[PDB]
Amino acid sequence: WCYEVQAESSNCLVPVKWGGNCQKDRQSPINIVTTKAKVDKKLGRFFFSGYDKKQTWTVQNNGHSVMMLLENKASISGGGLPAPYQAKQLHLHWSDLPYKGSEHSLDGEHFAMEMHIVHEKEKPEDEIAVLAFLVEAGTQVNEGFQPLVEALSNIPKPEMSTTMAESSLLDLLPKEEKLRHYFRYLGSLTTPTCDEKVVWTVFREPIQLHREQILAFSQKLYYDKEQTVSMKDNVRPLQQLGQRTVIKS
Numbered sequence: 001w002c003y004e005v006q007a008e009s010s011n012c013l014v015p016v017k018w019g020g021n022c023q024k025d026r027q028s029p030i031n032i033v034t035t036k037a038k039v040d041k042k043l044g045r046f047f048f049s050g051y052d053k054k055q056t057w058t059v060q061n062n063g064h065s066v067m068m069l070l071e072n073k074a075s076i077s078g079g080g081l082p083a084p085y086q087a088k089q090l091h092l093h094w095s096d097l098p099y100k101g102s103e104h105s106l107d108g109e110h111f112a113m114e115m116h117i118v119h120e121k122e123k124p125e126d127e128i129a130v131l132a133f134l135v136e137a138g139t140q141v142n143e144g145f146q147p148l149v150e151a152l153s154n155i156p157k158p159e160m161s162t163t164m165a166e167s168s169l170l171d172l173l174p175k176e177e178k179l180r181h182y183f184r185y186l187g188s189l190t191t192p193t194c195d196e197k198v199v200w201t202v203f204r205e206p207i208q209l210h211r212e213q214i215l216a217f218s219q220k221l222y223y224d225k226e227q228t229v230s231m232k233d234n235v236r237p238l239q240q241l242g243q244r245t246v247i248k249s
């Protein structure tokens with residue numbers, strides 16, 4: 001399987017031809033019409049555990065994205081979730097243009113990147129909880145992202161792995177006060193096999209990176225071990241909401 005962009009220069013199955021569960025009815029990502037999302041008072045604050053601890057994370061190019069291995073060293077609870085969820089991995093989706101790098105959209109507005117923090121239910125439509133943050137260009141270098149951005153030139157090819165300098169997950173997120181507002185729905189993984197087992201949370205507040213930090217991703221990373229196709233536009237096309245609803249805090 002591949003993204004649309006990889007087909008043009010392949011030395012593979014494009015998104016509209018993906019099999020498995022990818023052609024089903026409760027798929028992700030979606031466009032969120034914010035006025036159509038109903039406030040649900042049960043969507044309380046998230047509580048984070050291990051997000052404040054400095055770690056040296058392993059980060060790897062898996063041929064589709066760059067992925068930090070979180071190795072169960074952090075967890076979340078609250079946020080209307082039925083149970084705590086263990087953190088498994090963090091990865092991103094991006095482009096090199098400001099309005100075609102996110103997977104989800106808000107009222108038709110797209111962003112430059114989207115970051116996905118993937119967690120698994122501690123014990124189904126909510127086996128996996130993904131925390132989704134939308135990214136745009138701001139005025140300044142986001143210092144919290146510097147260890148990740150700095151690591152990228154050490155994993156230019158698929159299968160490569162490196163160790164980031166000391167950093168926390170908290171360093172990557174908005175101020176906690178700004179995480180109170182989010183959107184919630186049930187959907188799928190955004191890559192094959194597209195399993196309908198994800199409870200999604202899309203935070204309303206964008207993260208800001210400097211333009212140069214966002215461009216680093218497409219400038220330093222490659223889809224192929226021949227380094228001829230720059231990694232970008234790793235974005236699944238929008239899927240239909242159908243008879244689901246979106247709720248918000």
Ligand SMILES: CCN[C@H]1C[C@H](C)S(=O)(=O)c2sc(S(N)(=O)=O)cc21
Pocket residue numbers: 062064088089116118128130188189190191192
């Ligand atoms: C390369 C895609 N990997 C898949 C399977 C992995 C086992 S996972 O962590 O479940 C996961 S989370 C997402 S996303 N884009 O919906 O957040 C995709 C993936």
Ligand SMILES: [Zn+2]
Pocket residue numbers: 091092093116190
């Ligand atoms: Zn993702």
